[PDB]
Write a protein that binds this DNA or RNA. Structure first.
Lengths: 53, 116, 109
RNA sequence: GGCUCAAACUAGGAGCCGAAGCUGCGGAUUUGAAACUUGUUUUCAAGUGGUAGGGGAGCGUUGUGUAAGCCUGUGAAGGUGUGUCGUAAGGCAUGCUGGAGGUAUCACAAGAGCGAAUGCUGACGUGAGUAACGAUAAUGCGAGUGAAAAGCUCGCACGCCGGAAGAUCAAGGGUUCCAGUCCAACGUUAAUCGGGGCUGGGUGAGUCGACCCCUAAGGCGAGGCCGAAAGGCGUAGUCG
RNA sequence: CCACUGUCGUUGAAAAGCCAGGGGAUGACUUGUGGAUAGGGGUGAAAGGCUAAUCAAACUCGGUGAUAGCUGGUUCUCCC
RNA sequence: UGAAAUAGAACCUGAAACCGUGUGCGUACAAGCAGUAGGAGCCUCAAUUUAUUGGGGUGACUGCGUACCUUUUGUAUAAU
RNA sequence: GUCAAGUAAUGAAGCGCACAUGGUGGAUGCCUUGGCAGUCAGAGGCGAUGAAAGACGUGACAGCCUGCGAUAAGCUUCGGGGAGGCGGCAAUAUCCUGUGAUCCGGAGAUUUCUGAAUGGGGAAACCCACUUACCAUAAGGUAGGUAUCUUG
């Protein structure tokens, strides 16, 4: 249930090693030329040269 | 006449933590662990100061045995031949000669074998 | 040459902000800004905000060309902790650390 | 491991290895013996593992005299490294930081030395970014505002209570009530929202309640009784 | 109003609860307000039960730095 | 501005625990109080008429090595 | 150059030690407005002319502290003093001041309510009164008196 001896800093960092932040993929819409997440529509709303609104 | 222990305690603890430089974990950072490691390190140094002479005699004997067997003789007979020839060269010098000068050690083995 | 921005006192744990910082350390400002604006972590708003402050400093106070800038070095430090009481079962109390962090970003060629 | 005319056993023989034992070299020290003789010098002899414990010799820190001295803004104390010296406690010098104090030598006095006492106070770790986010009555979408909206306002739809989860009080609390304004702290998340911060407003009685008149239990109680003192009881009365 | 059974909970939503069942429910009943009984004392359809989350002698202060042939700790150095 | 702003109001100094970033070396075939006695390689400063020594950082590999205190006849003790 | 055998170096998801540079934190050093123990003197009480301790108010200015008491950071008088001042956090505004202000010392006046509280009561800062004199004509105001005990 509890430790018998306090974990060391190196041992604690070894578990943390795997944790990593996800980095989103980036594509530029040809019509609007703005950065946007892959397979996700742009801020403006232009997706694959189509008007959502 | 009150005495504050801060400055003297700081310097006392810094001495131990300085002697504990290079140690792992708490041993080089926190005093309760560092002080034991420093005392135990002193104990190991004290014991290995005795043990180093034995280890180096061991190494010299091994090298002298190797040289004597290259020249056709064993260590227990080569040293006996030295002692019968009244040659006082120590094992440290004998090992140095065996390692770095083969012909002189061959001459020494010849003298030992002539004395045997 | 290194222009600095500091964001002392963020209401977030340094351990959480460090994951964001590790991904923008050493990158160009454009790539770092892209990562931070498409990041899914709360630390990313603070890191982007400090990086933007640093870029503005380098462009206004020192007249640098931001086109050639880079995230020269970034690290997160622990700030002051707000100590709060958490009631538990059977009338027992626990202390709560609402941690803060200081974000330091330096940009340069 | 592996070993069979052995690397087993028996009886011998010769070599070597083998300890902090002995010897060799250098140094320190206790006692004793000799002499320049209170370390003034050199020697010799025997010693120098150590718990409880006894004896001897010192180190450092605070303060007093020495000291109206000496050092010190050409940088005191303190902090942090380095070099060097001594058997040790430790001393000395100096780079960096620091900004106003320190203290030589010898004496004198101690709140005079911390690693432990499930020791006390504060700070910070591991568990760990893990458990949990407090009734499984339920939310979906469109607008508004806003730096930002799953939670706020409005709208539509959905669901829950409905002898309550609706309304009026007493007790208790005391501004939590309404409006505007803000999101640092609080709200177990976000917050533009709030019983949160700040600034203003709001409580109108002959008939409601209190006060007031009356008294129950129970108190107190001119005189009175009792009791070492303090006080206890009690009549008329007065409160309740 | 009570608390007979079981699960859950046991660093709990809760320092005694929730859920499903259960008992009394016009009486030796339940409850609101005010008052009375005080520690070797009170009260007790009696369990040593209750007397402010404390009861084989409440709590606060004082005697008090109670006492403890017991446990723990007891801080710088070197020499014999 | 100030002499000084890592004297900027949580403000004289600013230690340690604890937590970051950077540079140098080592570490993914190897078992244990993590040190010590050796010791290759590498990096870095100084010399030196130029890879040889001296100082500093790391430590492949080999030998030895079961913490401290307390209490005990006796503790690495899995006794405190 | 092909094949075969043998054998180097290189790796770093992270980690370790050293150093450099930071964060946290508040030790250390220095400092004091505060305490402690004393010596030599003085004094040893305050109160029904209402005490100690309070509640509520009082400012140009919202809160607290300080002082003050409906004459409310205050008034009168008598001395000192001579240029600033309207107490502190804590400043601002209106102002005062050589016609002597602020400030200090002596005396006097005012001194709400509770509290021995003393007209009765009470859950302290509250309720209810009686009565003397005067004033008002309305549903009141001003100044008093009304506890108990002891001795005369």
């Amino acid at each position: 249930a509890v430790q018998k001896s306090r974990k060391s800093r190196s041992r604690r960092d070894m578990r943390r090693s795997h944790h990593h932040m996800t980095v989103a993929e980036l594509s530029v819409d040809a019509t609007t030329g703005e950065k946007h997440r892959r397979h996700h529509m742009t801020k403006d709303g232009f997706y694959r040269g189509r008007q959502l609104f | 006449a009150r005495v504050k222990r801060g400055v003297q305690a700081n310097r006392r603890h810094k001495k131990i933590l300085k002697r504990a430089k290079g140690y792992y974990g708490a041993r080089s950072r926190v005093y309760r662990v560092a002080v034991q490691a420093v005392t135990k390190a002193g104990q190991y140094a004290y014991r290995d100061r005795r043990n180093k002479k034995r280890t180096f005699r061991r190494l010299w004997i091994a090298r002298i045995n190797a040289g004597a067997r290259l020249n056709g003789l064993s260590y227990s007979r080569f040293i006996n031949g030295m002692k019968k020839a009244n040659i006082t060269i120590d094992r440290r010098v004998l090992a140095d000669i065996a390692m770095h000068d083969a012909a002189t050690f061959g001459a020494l083995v010849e003298k030992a074998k002539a004395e045997l | 040459m290194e222009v600095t921005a500091k964001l002392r006192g963020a209401a977030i744990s340094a351990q959480k902000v460090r994951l964001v910082a590790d991904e923008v350390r050493g990158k160009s400002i454009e790539r770092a800004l892209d990562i931070l604006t498409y990041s899914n972590k709360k630390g990313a708003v603070f890191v982007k905000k400090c990086l933007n402050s640093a870029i503005a400093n380098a462009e206004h106070n020192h007249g640098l060309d931001i086109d050639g800038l880079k995230v020269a070095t970034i690290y997160v430090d622990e700030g002051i902790t707000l100590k709060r009481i958490l009631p538990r079962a059977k009338g027992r109390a626990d202390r709560i650390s609402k941690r803060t962090c200081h974000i330091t970003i330096k940009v340069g060629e």
